[PDB]
Amino acid sequence: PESADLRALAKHLYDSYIKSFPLTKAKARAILTGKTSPFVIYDMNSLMMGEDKIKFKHKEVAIRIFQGCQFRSVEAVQEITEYAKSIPGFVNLDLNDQVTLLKYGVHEIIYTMLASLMNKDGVLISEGQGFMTREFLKSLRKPFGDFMEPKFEFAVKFNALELDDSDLAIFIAVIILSGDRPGLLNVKPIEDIQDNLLQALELQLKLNHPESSQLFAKLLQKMTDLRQIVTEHVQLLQVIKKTETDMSLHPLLQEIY
Amino acid sequence: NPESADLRALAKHLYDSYIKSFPLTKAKARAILTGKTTDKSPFVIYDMNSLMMGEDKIKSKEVAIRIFQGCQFRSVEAVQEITEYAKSIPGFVNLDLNDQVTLLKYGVHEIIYTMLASLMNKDGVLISEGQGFMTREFLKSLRKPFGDFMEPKFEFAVKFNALELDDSDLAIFIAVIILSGDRPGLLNVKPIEDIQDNLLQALELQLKLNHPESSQLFAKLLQKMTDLRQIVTEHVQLLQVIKKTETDMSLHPLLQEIYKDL
Ligand SMILES: CCCOc1ccc(C[C@@H](Cc2ccccc2)C(=O)O)cc1CNC(=O)c1ccc([C@]23C[C@H]4C[C@H](C[C@H](C4)C2)C3)cc1
């Protein structure tokens, strides 16, 4: 009777996730392990060539790579926002609450999905057209050399769970419906939905990974890791603001971010 | 079945050790707080004058400092109780000795604040084994530095207490907190995860059996671990500010080692 509505919710979220996100984990994995070619950016020259032959839409190199990261993050926010609207009950919530949920949830989701594009050696960029190495990113100067490393460390641990797209679709939804975000006006509806998304995620993981003991608990514990990454990220972005005088963009451009 | 029977046995063991390791339980704390009795009544410290009379009731030169050192001693004592409970956790003492220290190093404060909630309500906190009760306002009324050390704990407490867990639930939960295979610097992560995995199963069954109508309590409880980390970080930072404003205030050696490189 009810275990049916959970599978329906599960399938529904998956389908919606496929529609909203261009580069899925299944695709990114094939590209990454080989069994699928991505242009590789591992040093200054390879970057120079990559952006002149492939011209990635997203003066100093460290500063330009950091900005392309923001640009892509803004692009990603729209995909997540669209995906959110497909979660049963989301659009029916108080409008301000929907905005608050998205405002605080996009960073957690961004790093969660970013892991689907990373391995211990690098990250896929431009919808898989490229692969920027971990070492090259770690070789950037000033405080740019370590803005991505924290995401890599998190990815290696998160990816060990071996979740697939269908697992992630429900996890992303649970992240969005967090009732502890500041400023919420009506927490009950939000938590009632997350509670339903959590039961669906639990069944999904038990069916999809019978051998993975307590994968559910283990995945939920990763929330701690995600928020640490986010808070740490906010603090790095601030320091870049407090200092760094070559970050200037067109006034309209800066408004966009 | 055999499996769940083993998980219930584990829960009983943990609860039994918990009663033996922690003098002041949540059950005793609630009984005092809900003042349903005439013998468990605590003396209430809500201001300076009352504080002065409390010292005569409850059987280094400033108010904030004295209260602060009183907490330092208590947490040091709490660390010793938690360390005693930890040993009862099947498999814990059998792990590499370096990892035992590491697990305790990062787990004691998360557990301390988890358990402290048992002694809190929205208005204050039990002290001196429940004999006294210090109000939230009095504590928030302290000098600029110490004035806001406890507020974050109260905010967590009222929310965590909303879960209405009891001692038997908490015993397995604090056991899970300790057996965290993702602590910084762990040598052999697998044996730790194998134990936590088994504790997580015990906690899951326990919650379902003890709170049948509390949908997804297990998950809600796990998400609370995020709040614990947060309270710990804020506190760590709050201490750095203290040792700079109060060059004359001393921190107990044990706690300094726990916060070191944390
Ligand atoms: C003020 C209530 C706060 O109650 C707290 C708060 C945090 C902590 C742990 C904290 C300690 C610390 C924080 C920062 C740095 C290192 C460690 C930690 O390390 O996590 C423990 C207690 C438990 N506290 C008690 O049970 C408790 C018992 C007796 C008193 C006295 C009250 C007055 C009368 C008498 C003498 C003085 C004044 C002290 C007894 C005060 C507190």
Q: What is the CATH number of the domain that holds B186?
A: 1.10.565.10
C-alpha span between B76 and B82 (Å, rounded): 10
C-alpha span between B171 and B210 (Å, rounded): 13
- Set of chain B residues whose Cβ sits within 8 Å of the Cβ of A223: 223, 226
Residue A9 C-alpha, separation from nearest chain B C-alpha, in angstroms = 17
Cβ count within 10 A of residue B252: 14
C-alpha span between A221 and B219 (Å, rounded): 9
Rounded to the nearest 10 degrees, what angle do helices B97-116 and B151-161 cross at? 80
B211 is in an annotated binding site: no
| The residue to which tokens 């109060």 are assigned | B246
- Set of chain A residues whose Cβ sits within 8 Å of the Cβ of B175: none
C-alpha span between A174 and A84 (Å, rounded): 10
Inter-residue contact B116 to B130 (CB < 8 Å): no
B125 CA → ligand 1 middle, Å: 10
Of A122, A141, A117, A140, the C-alpha closest to A41 is A122
| The residue to which tokens 């009095």 are assigned | B138
Tell me how far CA of residue A210 lies from CA of A68, A87, A215, B201, in angstroms: 40, 26, 9, 14
Domain count, chain A: 1
C-alpha span between B204 and B219 (Å, rounded): 9
Q: Is the dihedral of CA B241, B247, B250, B254 positive or negative?
A: positive
Which structural technique was applied?
X-ray
Give the 3-state secondary structure of residue A54. Answer: coil
Give the 3-state secondary structure of residue A132. Answer: strand
Please give the residue of chain A at the shortest CA–CA distance from B227. A224
B71 CA → ligand 1 middle, Å: 2
Inter-residue contact A101 to A75 (CB < 8 Å): no
Pairing of strands A39-41, B132-135: unpaired
Residue B39 C-alpha, separation from nearest chain A C-alpha, in angstroms = 39
Sequence-distant (6+) residues with CB within 8 A of B184 are: B102, B106
Residues with a CB atom less than 6 Å from ligand 1? B 51, 54-55, 66-67, 70-72, 74-75, 109, 112, 125, 127-128, 134, 139, 150, 239, 251, 255
Residues of A with CB under 8 A from a CB of B: 157, 180, 195, 198-199, 202, 213-214, 216-218, 220-221, 223-225, 227-228
C-alpha span between B173 and B179 (Å, rounded): 10
Tokens of B118: 């048992």
- Set of chain A residues whose Cβ sits within 8 Å of the Cβ of B222: 217, 220-221
Sequence-distant (6+) residues with CB within 8 A of A122 are: A40, A131, A132, A133, A134, A136, A137
C-alpha span between B174 and B23 (Å, rounded): 16
Inter-residue contact B15 to B117 (CB < 8 Å): no
Which ligand 1 atom minimizes the distance to the CA of B71?
A: 24
Residue B177: domain span: 1-262
Sequence-distant (6+) residues with CB within 8 A of B196 are: B176, B179, B180, B181
Bridge partners (DSSP) of residue A119 are A122
C-alpha span between B104 and B179 (Å, rounded): 9
